[PDB]
Amino acid sequence: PIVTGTSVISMKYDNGVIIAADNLGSYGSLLRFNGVERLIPVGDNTVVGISGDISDMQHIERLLKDLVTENAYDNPLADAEEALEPSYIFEYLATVMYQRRSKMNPLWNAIIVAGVQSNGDQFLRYVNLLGVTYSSPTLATGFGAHMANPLLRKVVDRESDIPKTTVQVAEEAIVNAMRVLYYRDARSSRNFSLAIIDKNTGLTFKKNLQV
Amino acid sequence: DPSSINGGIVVAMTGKDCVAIACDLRLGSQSLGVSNKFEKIFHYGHVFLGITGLATDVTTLNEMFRYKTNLYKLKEERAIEPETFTQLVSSSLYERRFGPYFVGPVVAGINSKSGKPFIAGFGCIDEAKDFIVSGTASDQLFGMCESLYEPNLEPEDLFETISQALLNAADRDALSGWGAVVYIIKKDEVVKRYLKMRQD
Amino acid sequence: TSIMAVTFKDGVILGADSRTTTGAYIANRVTDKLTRVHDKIWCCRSQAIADIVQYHLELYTSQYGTPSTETAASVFKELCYEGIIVAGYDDKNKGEVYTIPLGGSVHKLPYAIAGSGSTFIYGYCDKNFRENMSKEETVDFIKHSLSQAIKWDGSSGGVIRMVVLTAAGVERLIFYPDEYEQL
Amino acid sequence: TSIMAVTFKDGVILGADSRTTTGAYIANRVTDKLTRVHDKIWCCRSQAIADIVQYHLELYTSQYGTPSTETAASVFKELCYEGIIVAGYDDKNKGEVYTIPLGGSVHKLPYAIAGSGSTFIYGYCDKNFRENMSKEETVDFIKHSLSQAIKWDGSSGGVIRMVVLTAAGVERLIFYPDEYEQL
Amino acid sequence: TTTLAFRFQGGIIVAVDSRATAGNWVASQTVKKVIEINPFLLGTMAGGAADCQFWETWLGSQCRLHELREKERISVAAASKILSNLVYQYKMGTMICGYTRKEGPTIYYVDSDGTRLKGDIFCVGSGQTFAYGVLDSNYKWDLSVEDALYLGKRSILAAAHRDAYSGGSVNLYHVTEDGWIYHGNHDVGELFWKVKEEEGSFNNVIG
Amino acid sequence: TTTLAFRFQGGIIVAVDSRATAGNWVASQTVKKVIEINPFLLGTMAGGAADCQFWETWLGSQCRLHELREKERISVAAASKILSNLVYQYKMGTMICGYTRKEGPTIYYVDSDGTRLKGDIFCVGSGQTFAYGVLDSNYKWDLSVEDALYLGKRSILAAAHRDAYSGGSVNLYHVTEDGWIYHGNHDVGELFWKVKEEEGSFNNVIG
Amino acid sequence: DIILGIRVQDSVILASSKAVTRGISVLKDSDDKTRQLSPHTLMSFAGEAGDTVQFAEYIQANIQLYSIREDYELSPQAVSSFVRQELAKSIRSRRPYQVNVLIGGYDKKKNKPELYQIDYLGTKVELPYGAHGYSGFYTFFLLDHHYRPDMTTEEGLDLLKLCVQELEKRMPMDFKGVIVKIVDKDGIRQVDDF
Amino acid sequence: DIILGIRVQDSVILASSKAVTRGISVLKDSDDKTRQLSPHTLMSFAGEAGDTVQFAEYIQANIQLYSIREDYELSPQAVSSFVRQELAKSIRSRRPYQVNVLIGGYDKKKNKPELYQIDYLGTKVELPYGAHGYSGFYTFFLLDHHYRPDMTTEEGLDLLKLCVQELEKRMPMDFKGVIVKIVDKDGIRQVDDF
Amino acid sequence: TTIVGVKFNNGVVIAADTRSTQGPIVADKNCAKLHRISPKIWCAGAAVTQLIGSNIELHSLYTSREPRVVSALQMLKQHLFKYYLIVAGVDPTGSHLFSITDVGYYLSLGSGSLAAMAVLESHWKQDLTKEEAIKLASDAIQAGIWNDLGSGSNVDVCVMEIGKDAEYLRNYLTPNVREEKQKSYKFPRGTTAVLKESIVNI
Amino acid sequence: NPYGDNGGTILGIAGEDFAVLAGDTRNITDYSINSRYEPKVFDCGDNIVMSANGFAADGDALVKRFKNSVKWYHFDHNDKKLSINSAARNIQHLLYGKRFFPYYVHTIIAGLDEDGKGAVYSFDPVGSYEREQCRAGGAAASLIMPFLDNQVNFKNQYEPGTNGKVKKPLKYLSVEEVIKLVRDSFTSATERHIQVGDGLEILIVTKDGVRKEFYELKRD
C-alpha cells in the first residue's frame, strides 16, 4: 500500500461485539490524513473494520453498499428475516479477497467483520489479502495483533470467558488498548472510532473518541 | 549447511544413578553411505562426548579434546569432570565463534565425587536433566524422547528407552542409520552395545 | 513541483510552480501545470490520464449535464485505481478540493498541497491556513506557501501560476520570482 | 527525530523530541537525545562517536584548557569524516551552532534543524526565525517548530526536551504533549 | 527412490522401493511407486509422482477408449507415445511395461525431457547406479522367473542399502502375456538380513 | 591462437601462429608467441601473454643464476616446476621445451590451473583441435627434421584455416641438443596456397 | 550427440553416435539418431534430449504426407528447404527445437548425391562433408586434407572411419561408437560392421 | 578422476584413471595419479587439476623428511592421520586443496594391509574398499556382494577388473583405463597388464 | 524470548522466560537468560557476558570498589561496537536500567517484547514497590509467554534492591508444567535387538 | 507471495474398524497466535472427515470445493453415499485442476472403506494420493509419526528372549487405545514445537458415524 490504515481491534462480550479503529491514514512516515473512517457499518447488525491500503478500503466500502442495494432487490423482507447477516458479509468479502489473490491482484487489506447473527450469536471473523480467515474471542490487525491482543486476551482468554464479560468491561479494555496503541505505534492517532453491536440494544457507533 | 552433509544423530539420557549416550554409525557423503563404523561418541576418562555434524569437524574436535583433557590430567593430576568438560567444550567452541565447527556436541557422564548423572547440550550450555539430542533427526529424536522418557529409569529400562528412541528416530531419518551403539554409563562400569537396525 | 489548491469564501484557487526537471536539468521553466479537464474543474499532477478524464467528463456533460468536482475525482479514481489535486467550483458546492495521492485513494480537503516542495510547507500551511479566507488572503496564502516551497525544493521554481475558480469565472494569475521571492 | 538548535541574544538553546522508533514501533518514548560532550557543549544526532568526542574534549580540557564549540565540531568532523547538531556557549563566542550533515561537512549557522521532522518545518523556521531573539521568544519559536515537526513526522513525538546554554549556566526544560500540541 | 524393470524370457520384472522423503524426513515407507494402468500395463514413478499418477491413470482411460473403438488393446508403443507427447508438451522418469501379442514384452522409458527409449533394462532414481550394476552383473535373457524375481529384489536391496533416499520395502511385479502379477511387498530391513545370511554378501555389516 | 610442440628423433619442433585479436578486431598479425627463455629453452604463449612473457623471462634469469652457482644449466623439469609453482601460487597454457644432455628432448605443459605434464605432443589455443588432429594423423618418432618442420607448418595451417582466431603466419622453431634453431616466419596466406597446390588438399577452396 | 556426414561421388554417408545419457548413467548405447524422410532421403539429427526425436518425426510425417498427396518424391533440395523453414520458424516460437540435422539424399532426377547441414537456428548450407557442434573440431582437419569430389563409397567410409577414430581419441566423451548409413540411387542401407 | 582402492588379506590394490582432460581435448591418456609416500605406503589422489599434484608432493616431501630425520618409517595409520590433518588445515585456509586421496599401505609391524579414504574436507575412514566421488556409485554394489576379508591378491584384482568394466559401461565419461598398483610386505609394484 | 526490566522505588527488577528455540523446535525448555555480570549487576539478552563479567571482577579487584552499572554498560557497548541486552543493577550511585543505549523506567526485549510492553504500558506507574514491581514484570513475562510463540515455560526473576543482596528467583513462576501422560511407555526388557555387547575399560 | 504458513499438524490413523483424524486447533502467523480454536478437521458427510493442512486460504478453498462436489454427487446419484475411494479420486481431480498454481496444502481424508475397515488417504498438493494406514501432516509431523510407528506398528520392537529374531506381533488397537496414543504424541509435540498447542480436536469415524473429541493442550 501507499496510504495505509493502522490496527483494528475487536472483541466479543456476553451480549455482542465491540470493534475499534483510529481515524488516520499514514503516508509512509508522514501522518497525512486524519479523517479516515475505517469502521464500516453494514446494516444494523454488522460493522466492517478495514486496515491497510486506503484506496482498496474505499473500494471495499463501495462493494459493501452495492451488496446492501442488491439484497433489497425484489426482497420485501430485506429489513427483516431476509437481511444481510455478518456471516453473509464476511463470506462475500472473503470470497472477493481470495479471488483477488488468485488473480495476483490482491486487495491489500486486513478485514475484521464484527456483528451479531439473527439467532443472537456473536460474529467476529478476520480475513486478509491472502484470503486467510480465522475467528477468535478477540481479534486485532497489524500492530494491535501484537500489543492489543495480549491486553484483550487478558479479559477474554477463551470462549467460556465471553458470557462473563460485560459491555462495560469490554469497552474499558478496548479503550485501554487504543491508548496503549497510541503510545507505542508511530502510525496511530489520538482519535478513533468505536462501534458496539449488541444483540439487545443494537448497533452503537461512537465517533471521535480520543485517547 | 555442512551439518547435513554427513548425517548422524547423538542422544543422551539420564537414568537412576546412570547415564546413557547413543549414536548411529552411518558415515555418509550426501545420499551415498560410505562407512557404517563411524562412531560419533568418544570418552576422555569417565566423561563421554557425542559429536554430530561434519565428520572432519568431529575428528578434529575429538583430537582437540583428547589433547586438552590429556594436558588437564597432567596439570591437575586428576581426570576432568563432566561439568568442567562441558565448560571446556563451550569455551573451545566459542574460541572459533566466526570460524565455527559445524558440530553438535553432547556431554554425558557421572561426576566422580557427587555421583550424580550429568548430560549437556550446546557454546550455550543446555544442561538438561532428562535428555539431549543432536543431529539431522533432532526433531524425530525430540518426539521420541518426549514421548518415551520417564525419570529415574534403571539401567536396563534406560537402555531400552534410549535404544527405542534412537532406532525409531533413525528409521525416519534418511541420513541416519547403518547401525547404532549405546553406552550405558554407571560409576562402576560402562557397557557398550551395538543395536540391530535396518540397513537402508 | 509545488502545487496547492485552497478553498475560500468565494471558491477555490489552484496554484502551481512552472519548473519541470530531469534530474538537475531544468528542461522547461515556463511549464503550465494547471490543466483544465472541464469548464470549471481543473487538476494538477505532483498527462494521458488527463486526456481520458476530459474525454469522460465531456461525455458526461453531453448526456448527464454539468459534472461536479466529485464526478471528476470519481472518474480520476476509476482510471487511476484501475498524485492528483482536483479543484473545481459548482454553484451548490461553492468550490471543492480533492486530492488523489499515489495510492489511488480520494480525499476531500479544505486545501491540498502536493509535490516534492509540499513537504517543506506542511508546517507552514498548517499554521497559516484559515477557513473562509478572502480572495486576496487566499492568493497571499498561496503566494507565501509556494515561495517557501520554491526556495527549499530544487524541482520547484519559475513563475507561480494561479487559477481562481469562482462563480464569476476563471481568472489566471501569474507571479514572477522578482515578486514572490522577496515575500 | 526532530532536533533544532537556535542561537539567541544570551546564548543557544538545543531542543529535541523524545521518540525513538524501530519502524512503526515506538521503542522508547522518553528518550533523552540532547547529549553533553563538554560542560557547556551539547550535541544531538538526527552514540559511540559521542563517547569518543567526549574523551577527546576531556583530554583537550586537561591539556589546553576549555575547548570551544568549534573545537568540538572539529573533533566530530575528524572522527566522522575519517547528522550532528553541535551547540555550545563560550564567553567570547556567546553561543554557536554547528551542523554536521551526513556527508561530514561542518557548517556554522544561526540556527539548525535536523531529523526526519525538520523537512516539514523548513519553511516555517525560515519564515519565523529572527536574529537576536529573547530567551522566551526563542523557547516559543522552538516549541512551535518542534510541535509542527511532531505533528507531521511519525518518528517524532513525546516530550520536547530543551537545553538552554548561556553564561548563567545550563537549564533543562521539558514540554509535554498536552502543552505544545495545543499551540 | 529406485525403480527397475528388465525384460527376460518369462516377461518383465518390475521392482521398486517404497520410500518417500521430504528432504531428510522420511514421510512414508509404504509408497506405491507402480501405477497399474490396466491389467496388462504398468507404469513406474520416479520423481513427479503426481504428474505420473494423474497422466498414467488418464493413460488407462485412453487405452480403454481404444479398446472399445478398435476392439483391440492399445500397444505399449502407443501408450508410451501418448505419455511422451503429454510430457513433452508440458516440458521425472517412468517405465511403461506391457506384454501384448504383437510386440511381446515391451518396456519404454519416458523422462521429463520428452525422451522415449525402448530397451531391455532400465533403472531410474537416486539409487539407479547400484541397481544398474546388480542387473548388469547378473541379468540374463534365459533367466528363470524365480531367479528374475530375486534379481529384482537384489538390485533394489543394493540401492536401498547404499542410497539414503531408497529403502522401506521392495514391491515386485511380473508382467506376463496374461497380465501382470504382483509378487508382494518385501521389507528391506528383513530382506537385507536374509540376503546377508544366505548370500554371504555385505561382509562389512556386522550381524 | 594455436601453439604446438612435438618430440621426434631430431629434437623438438615448436610451431605457433602470430595472430592477436581484440574481440573480432585483429590487432596484430606478427605477434611472437615463442619465448626464447635462453639459447636452450623455449616457452610458448597461449592466453595470458603478459604473465607468460614476464615470468618466462624471469625463469631465464633464474636459469642463469643456477648456471652460475652449480656450473650446470637448469633442467627442463626444473624450469617447468618453477613456472608451475609460480602459476599455482597466483591461481593460460605454456609449453616448456628444451634439450639437455641428461633428459634429452623434453616438453612440459604448464597451464593456468597449475597442471604440469610431460609428453611428446601438445597443442594449445583456440585451434588446438585441428592442429592436434593433423599431428595425431601424421606424427612419427622416426620423422625427419624436414618432414617434422613441414608437419608443424601443416598443423598450424589447418588450425589457421579452420579457426577464426588463428592465422597470420607460422613461426617454426627446432630445439636441438645444441640449442634451438629458428626456421623462419611463413605467411599463412602464401602457405595455404602452396600447400593446396603441392598437396591437393583443401579441395573445397576455389583457387 | 556426434553426427558426421560425407558426400562422395555417388552417395552420401551419415554416421551418428550410439550413446544416450541422462544425468548420471548411460541409458542406451545403441540409439539410431536418423529418420528416413523418403526412399532416397535420410535425416540425422542431434541436440536437446526430447526435441530431436519430436522434430524428426514431425518432419518425417510431413514429407510422407507430401509423397502420398502428390504420388511423387520431393527432391533432397526441396526436403532440405522445408526442414530449414521449420527450424527457422521454431527459433522464434514459444519454445524452439534445439535440433541440428544433417540431410543426406540422392536426387533421382539430377542423379547426384546431396548433403545439407542445418543448425537449430535454421542455417542451411550444402556441404561435401559436415558435422554439428564440436564434432567438426576433430574431423575437419582430416576431411580438408583427404576429401576429393570423386571419392568412391569405400574411400568415404575409410575417411569416415579415420574421422571417428580421432573423435574417440581426443574428445573427452564416450559416445559408444557410431551407426553408419549410406544413401545412394539404390536407397538407404546401413553399415553394421563399422 | 577415478580412484579405486581395495584391501585384501595381505595387500592393498589401488586403481587410478589415466585420462587428463583440460577443456576441449584429452591432453594425456597415461597419467599416474599416485605418489609413493614411503617404501610400504602409497597415496592415490583425485580432484582439482592443479591442487592434487601440489598437495601430493607436499605430503611426500613431509613423509620423506620424517623418514630421514628418524631413520624410521611412519606406519600407514600415522601417515593417514598426517594427511587428514593437512586436508583439515587446508579446508579452512585461504584456498583449500580440492583433493580426495586413498592411502594404501602395509604396516610392517602389524603385518596387516591398511586402506584409508580421506576426502578434501578431511574425513578419514579405514575401509576394506573405497572410491572417491561418483566412482563408488558404480562399484559399491559389486564389492558389497563379492568382497571377503580373506580374498587373495588375484581375487582382488579380478574384482577390481569387474568394477572397472562396470565403470566403463555406465559412467558417461572416457577415463582411458586405469593404472593398477599393489602395496604389500614386499613393497609397491605396478600391474601393467590390466 | 521475553525479557523485561522494571525499576521500582528502591531498585530494579529483571525477568525473563526460560524457553530456547532452534527454529520452531524448543531446544531448552528451562534456559536461564538472566546472566550475572557482578553480584548486583545482571544482564539478559534476546560469551560476551562471561568475558564482561570476568573483566568487571578484575576491575573491581583492581580498584577495590564495587562494580558500577555504567562500567558494565560501557564495556558491553565498546565490545559490541567493536564487532541486544538489558543491563540492570544497583551500584553505590543507585539502581540503573539500560538497554543496548537507552535508559528506562521499564524495558522489554525479544520476540514477546510487544506483549510485555503492552502489559507494562497498561499497568506501570511511578513509585512502584518491590512486590508491585515483581508482579508487573512477571505479568509482562506471562503475556509474552501466552501470546508469543518464541516465549514459553517459566518466569525467572532477579530483584536488585539498593541496600540489599540481589535475589535471583529462578523459576519464580512455572505455569507450563506438563500433565501426566495417558500411558506409561516403559518397554519390557529384551525388546531391543542387540548385535554385540562389551564392557568398556574407562 | 500468494502463499503462507498458518501452522497446524494433522494425524490420520486407520484402524481395523475405525478411522481417526486429529489436529491441533491453534492458528498462527509467524510468531503470533491468530486463534487458539480454529478447527482444521472437518466432517464432510458420508462418514468422511477431511483436513487440508498447509496454506489456510487454499485449505479453506479445497475443503469448500470438495464439500461442493459431495453435494453435486448427491444431486446426480440420488443421495447415494460417496465412498472414500471415490472421494479420494475426486480430490485428486480437484487438486490437479490447478496443476501449475496448486493448492499449497497436503490434505488427509479418513473414513471407512466399502468393506467397513478404516481408510486414510494422503494427497500431495499437486494431486498424487495413496491409501495409508497412518499419515501425519504439518510442521510437527516428524515429532509424532515416529512415536506412533513404534507404538501402533511396534517398529524396532521384538519379543523378549528371542534375541531379536521374533518381532513383537501386531495387535488390534481399540479406538480408545489409539486416542491415548494420539493424545500423548500431541502433548509431546506441544512441548517441543512452538506451533503445536491450545487444544487437540479428534474426529473418530466408525460405522455409527463421526464422533468429535476435544482435549486441551498447553497454551504457551
UniProtKB/Swiss-Prot annotation, chain A:
Keyword line: Cytoplasm, Nucleus, Proteasome
GO cellular component: cytosol; nucleus; proteasome complex; proteasome core complex, beta-subunit complex; proteasome storage granule
Annotated GO biological process: proteasomal ubiquitin-independent protein catabolic process; proteasome assembly; proteasome-mediated ubiquitin-dependent protein catabolic process
Domain of life: Eukaryota
Keyword Cytoplasm: yes
Cell location: Cytoplasm; Nucleus
Record-annotated membrane-spanning stretches: none
Disulfide bond positions: none
Subunit structure: The 26S proteasome consists of a 20S proteasome core and two 19S regulatory subunits. The 20S proteasome core is composed of 28 subunits that are arranged in four stacked rings, resulting in a barrel-shaped structure. The two end rings are each formed by seven alpha subunits, and the two central rings are each formed by seven beta subunits. The catalytic chamber with the active sites is on the inside of the barrel. Interacts with CIC1.
Family: Belongs to the peptidase T1B family.
Note: Present with 16900 molecules/cell in log phase SD medium.
Protein name per its UniProtKB record: Proteasome subunit beta type-7
Species this protein is from: Saccharomyces cerevisiae (strain ATCC 204508 / S288c)
Highest classification ranks of the organism: Eukaryota, Fungi, Dikarya, Ascomycota, Saccharomycotina
Gene name tied to this protein: PRE4
Range of the intact protein held here: 37 to 247 of 266
Curated annotation (Swiss-Prot), chain B:
Chain residue numbers at which the record places covalent cross-link Glycyl lysine isopeptide (Lys-Gly) (interchain with G-Cter in ubiquitin): K68
Subcellular location: Cytoplasm; Nucleus
One GO BP annotation of this record: proteasomal ubiquitin-independent protein catabolic process
Gene3D superfamilies according to UniProt: Glutamine Phosphoribosylpyrophosphate, subunit 1, domain 1
CDD domains from the UniProt entry: proteasome_beta_type_3
Residues found modified as Phosphoserine: S29
Pfam families from the UniProt entry: Proteasome (PF00227)
Keyword terms: Cytoplasm, Isopeptide bond, Nucleus, Phosphoprotein, Proteasome, Ubl conjugation
InterPro entries, per database record: Ntn_hydrolases_N, Proteasome_beta_3, Proteasome_bsu_CS, Proteasome_sua/b, Proteasome_suB-type
Parts forming coiled coils: none
GO molecular function: endopeptidase activator activity
Gene Ontology annotations for the cellular component aspect, listed alphabetically: cytosol; nucleus; proteasome complex; proteasome core complex, beta-subunit complex
Assembly: The 26S proteasome consists of a 20S proteasome core and two 19S regulatory subunits. The 20S proteasome core is composed of 28 subunits that are arranged in four stacked rings, resulting in a barrel-shaped structure. The two end rings are each formed by seven alpha subunits, and the two central rings are each formed by seven beta subunits. The catalytic chamber with the active sites is on the inside of the barrel.
Annotated family: Belongs to the peptidase T1B family.
Protein name: Proteasome subunit beta type-3
Gene of this entry: PUP3
UniProtKB/Swiss-Prot annotation, chain I:
Primary subcellular site in the record, as a coarse category: cytoplasm
List of catalytic residues: T1 (nucleophile)
Keyword vocabulary terms for this entry: Cytoplasm, Hydrolase, Nucleus, Protease, Proteasome, Threonine protease, Zymogen
Cell compartment(s), UniProt: Cytoplasm; Nucleus
Keyword Cytoplasm: yes
EC code: 3.4.25.1
BP GO terms, sorted: proteasomal ubiquitin-independent protein catabolic process; proteasome-mediated ubiquitin-dependent protein catabolic process
Source organism, top-level taxon: Eukaryota
Enzyme class: hydrolase
GO molecular function, one term: endopeptidase activity
Annotated S-S bridges: none
This protein's GO CC annotations: cytosol; nucleus; proteasome complex; proteasome core complex, beta-subunit complex; proteasome storage granule
Catalytic activities: Cleavage of peptide bonds with very broad specificity
Other comments on record: The side chain of Thr-1 acts as a nucleophile, and the N-terminal amino group acts as a proton acceptor.
Recorded family membership: Belongs to the peptidase T1B family.
Job description of the protein: The proteasome degrades poly-ubiquitinated proteins in the cytoplasm and in the nucleus. It is essential for the regulated turnover of proteins and for the removal of misfolded proteins. The proteasome is a multicatalytic proteinase complex that is characterized by its ability to cleave peptides with Arg, Phe, Tyr, Leu, and Glu adjacent to the leaving group at neutral or slightly basic pH. It has an ATP-dependent proteolytic activity.
Protein name: Proteasome subunit beta type-2
Organism encoding this protein: Saccharomyces cerevisiae (strain ATCC 204508 / S288c) (Baker's yeast)
Record gene name: PUP1
Residues of the full protein shown: 30 to 249 of 261
Swiss-Prot record, chain J:
Keyword presence, Nucleus: yes
Lineage per the UniProt record: Eukaryota, Fungi, Dikarya, Ascomycota, Saccharomycotina
Family assignment from sequence similarity: Belongs to the peptidase T1B family.
Name of the gene this protein is made from: PRE7
SUPFAM superfamilies per record: N-terminal nucleophile aminohydrolases (Ntn hydrolases)
Main location: cytoplasm
Function: Non-catalytic component of the proteasome which degrades poly-ubiquitinated proteins in the cytoplasm and in the nucleus. It is essential for the regulated turnover of proteins and for the removal of misfolded proteins. The proteasome is a multicatalytic proteinase complex that is characterized by its ability to cleave peptides with Arg, Phe, Tyr, Leu, and Glu adjacent to the leaving group at neutral or slightly basic pH. It has an ATP-dependent proteolytic activity.
Record-given protein name: Proteasome subunit beta type-6
GO cellular component: cytosol; nucleus; proteasome complex; proteasome core complex, beta-subunit complex
Gene3D superfamilies: Glutamine Phosphoribosylpyrophosphate, subunit 1, domain 1
